[PDB]
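Thread: magnesium ion complex, take 2
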Amino acid sequence: MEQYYGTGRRKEAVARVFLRPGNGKVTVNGQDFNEYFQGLVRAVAALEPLRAVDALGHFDAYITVRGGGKSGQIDAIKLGIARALVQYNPDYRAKLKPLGFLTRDARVVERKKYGKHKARRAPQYSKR
Amino acid sequence: ARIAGVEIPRNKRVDVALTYIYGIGKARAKEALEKTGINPATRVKDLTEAEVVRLREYVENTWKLEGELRAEVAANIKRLMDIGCYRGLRHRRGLPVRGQRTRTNARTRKGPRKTVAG
Amino acid sequence: SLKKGVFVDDHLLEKVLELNAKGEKRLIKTWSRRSTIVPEMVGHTIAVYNGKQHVPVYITENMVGHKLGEFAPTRTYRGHGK
Amino acid sequence: ARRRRAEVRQLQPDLVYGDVLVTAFINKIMRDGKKNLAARIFYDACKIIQEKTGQEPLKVFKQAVENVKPRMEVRSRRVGGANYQVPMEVSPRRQQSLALRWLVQAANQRPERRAAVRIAHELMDAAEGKGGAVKKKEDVERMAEANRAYAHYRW
Amino acid sequence: GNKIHPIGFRLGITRDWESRWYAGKKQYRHLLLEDQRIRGLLEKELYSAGLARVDIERAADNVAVTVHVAKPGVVIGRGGERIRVLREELAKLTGKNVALNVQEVQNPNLSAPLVAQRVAEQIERRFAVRRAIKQAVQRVMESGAKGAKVIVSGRIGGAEQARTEWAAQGRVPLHTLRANIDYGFALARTTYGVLGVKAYIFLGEV
Amino acid sequence: ARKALIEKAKRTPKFKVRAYTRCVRCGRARSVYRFFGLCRICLRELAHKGQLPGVRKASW
Amino acid sequence: GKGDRRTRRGKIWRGTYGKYRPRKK
Amino acid sequence: KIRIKLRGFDHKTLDASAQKIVEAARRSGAQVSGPIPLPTRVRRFTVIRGPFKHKDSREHFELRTHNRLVDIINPNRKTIEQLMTLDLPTGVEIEIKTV
Amino acid sequence: GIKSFKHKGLKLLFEKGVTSGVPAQDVDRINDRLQAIDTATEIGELNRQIYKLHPLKGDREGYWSITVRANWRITFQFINGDAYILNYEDYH
RNA sequence: CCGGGCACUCUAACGGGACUGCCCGCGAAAGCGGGAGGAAGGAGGGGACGACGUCUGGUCAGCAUGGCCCUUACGGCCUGGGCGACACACGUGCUACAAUGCCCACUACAAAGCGAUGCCACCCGGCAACGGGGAGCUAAUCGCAAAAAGGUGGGCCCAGUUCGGAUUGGGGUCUGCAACCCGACCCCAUGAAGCCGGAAUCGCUAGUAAUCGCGGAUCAGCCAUGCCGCGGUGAAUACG
RNA sequence: CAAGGAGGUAAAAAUGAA
Ligand SMILES: [Mg+2]
Ligand SMILES: [Mg+2]
Ligand SMILES: [Mg+2]
Ligand SMILES: [Mg+2]
Ligand SMILES: [Mg+2]
Ligand SMILES: [Mg+2]
Ligand SMILES: [Mg+2]
Ligand SMILES: [Mg+2]
Ligand SMILES: [Mg+2]
Ligand SMILES: [Mg+2]
Ligand SMILES: [Zn+2]
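Output below.
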């Protein structure tokens, strides 16, 4: 029906966020924003930028997600939701900065380095 | 109920209670009660005496178990008595049968450490 | 553990079968456990190599899947100080 | 040699509550990095608080932490091959950390069967001033009490 | 010590390859062995030329081979031999397009392989090594170089005691990537053993 | 046993399982990559030489 | 029971499949 | 209809030689789908840095094999004429098939 | 009497006469030493000037060391008329 | 999945992007602290890069090479044995002692790589390993793979116990000329020690430790619980 | 504000290689 940007990424996760101006606070992809994310406590934190603004269900969510696991996807959705409402509302910048909902968060899994057992964990020794 | 040579397991699921017999384990367990046609999740507490009879009659027959098959197993090792093979000597010396590492480990057949020192 | 093969040495069997018609002498060697116990010629002795010498092993039924060299230990051990 | 004073790590606020404290507690619950199971247990126990008492877990948990706060603790210091134990004050950061740590530990010390009921009960006991963690807190303050002699070494 | 090969350290940016062909599996192994046997066969009966490089290129039975030499004196005009069957003897285990070219390395005093090889000859001539090192460096530095460094290690002047003679003028930054640093090496065979000569030649970049 | 041993490695008859890899540049029997037909030692040498087409240092 | 050959978990760890871990569907 | 593939170890030679064929096909009467960047097949291997026996601290190498695709529409012998045997690679392997 | 070896080359030279485990020019040298350590009824007999005998210190305590040639030493434990753990080691 | 379109995602090639440049303060300067500035900052987070030299360090068994030695042999071929021996001692590890746990069923969410002298979809037999077929794939096309921890449901109820899997009997399968010494799996039955570790001792400061599975090299097969990589969920604390 | 001269000083921790 409609379109509003959408590019949220966090630790190898890609989420395209749209939102369509309608009172139906809806979902996307598999099932519900619930259902697909049930049993997961921190899953509902992706909708916090909407709480930061005046959106108590004014948009119809549409986020296709891929890559990583749920938590990264959820994190990426947060970046995409914010990337939408900051796009078609350029004055909604003065809340995405103090609250910091706009950052790709470069925190990604560090490489296995040789010698070490895994990333940084040293292989443990005895002199004797 | 004195099923085979044992009777012990009371209030604890017949599919589990069965396990408490040398010869039953876990696979023969549910296999025996599906072939006898009895609910696995039952109390074991002396339920329907008929189910118990059928169970006993099937289980105790069919395949060898308890003290009888312990005797057969011990006799299969006694096979390599006579002038037996290499595998027999491993049962003789008390060392691991399957040719594994004995430089360390192998404590489950050797037993606890003895320590020589020198 | 073979099933459709279940093999014995051809050369062990050649020597074993052509010396099986109406009787023989127990003088028969080999160099391979590789084979199998072989029914017939049960009342026989097969000098199996253990890496050092030829040990006369004797067949008296009882044995089958155990080829030969299981009846020919290669090590000695014997004791560890005690 | 700590050239940097190591800035205080800040957390994410939880769901439904907004705590700047509860998440720190959920983290201590967390083992092997499973925040799902960790958070669930706490919120589970929060539901358990509602049953045995008609109190909102946001205060029951809050007061429990406040009751398991070490005013002063014992610190081993200088001269004599580190022979002394100066009783020192406890920083608000450290009272914070000890409270939550002792809570979870004492909680798993309990003979109960489910992790949630251990958390819930240990919190209710601690809110009253009865918990095994409160024992630990009061114990650490005994040690700090008995060392007032060379407390003047201070620092 | 322990330092990485200044050639391999570049390879990508600065200093390109020496055998430039593409293949997938089932072919790479065979074509690399042939390629190396070309380098092996050439080095033998072409040392008197003193070859700085042996570039090789391929394109399905095309095998181009470029031999860089200070003085291509051993080529001698078309049918004057020293090329005919010589570039044709390659295809006795190849049979492919043995396209053998010859390059003229202008200044041998700026070619690291040639420098080290001249030094390694002098070791076998029983020359005074320390003086030989000094001269070769200045000789390289005399021909416009931005920096040079020669290294002979082990068994210097015979005598039971492995040594390491060291000399270097100007600038030689090995750590920098935009370096254009030529590296050469040579085995000096002596009646008392074997010693290795390293030669570093540096020019600007950016 | 080294010269007559790099003979067998190319000879390869008599049972298919008796055949084995072997570095060509050297005579190494261990750590022999099927891709190059070289041992890990030789492979490193030539990779620094530049005589290995496409082969380049790995940094990431 | 990562080392028990009679679990979907031990069969994972071992890699192989079987009766206690079928090759899907 | 004509599909051409260009594999290569050097990306700079590929990104240039497979761009020549975009110019030599466009200026001969055809529509050309530009340099399609197929993903790379990186072939790494890790070797112990020393000839001795120093297991910790080694050094690894990689052999990146690049793939690039280009499609031209009508197989007219006007565009065919140029891309027939006017090949300028350095060993770059080229595949030409129509389906 | 020599009763146990730690060095295989040493072991082979004294037992089978296999000389391929030691230096070729030290064959006669090592031999006369081993026979001396074999005939020795006490450590006092292994005291000829050309052996430079001495017991080792530290973790090698209980061991002895006669000199073959240069930086090379034959080390062993002498006890009750017998030497044990005959090794062929380095001065550094 | 088609028509069509390629703006999103992605793919891979060149670029832009902070240089504490800008504000307040400190200072002689360098610089330090603080603040809007943006994805990012006062070397952004990781790699590759290891000075003169030290250890008579390491490697003549990768290779090269001075010297010493062996040559009907210290060389060459073969079958077999051995490197896998076991009263013991030490290193690095794997799997655990359980209920923030175990079993069964259902149901999701990855990345990095490997394959047509192979990966092998889908059917058929089989409790299963696997065998019979047999389509596609010179591979962002087909296949290896369903990621697992997670979620939902249900069952055990704290007990050497549905924890734990060692050891042992039996029955099978696959590679291989052949698996007794000495192969990996599958299935039935056994189910040991261990209820959390003495003196001591190790690792890690942010996607980090922990925990979870996934690929590759070698490789007929495999003794890999190893090594080199990949991503999933994701702490604690630093006064000094 | 810028210090001269004044005085209480570590612990329990020994050895050395060929
Ligand atoms: Mg990880
Ligand atoms: Mg290691
Ligand atoms: Mg640098
Ligand atoms: Mg030395
Ligand atoms: Mg040699
Ligand atoms: Mg070994
Ligand atoms: Mg016990
Ligand atoms: Mg218990
Ligand atoms: Mg650090
Ligand atoms: Mg003394
Ligand atoms: Zn080699």
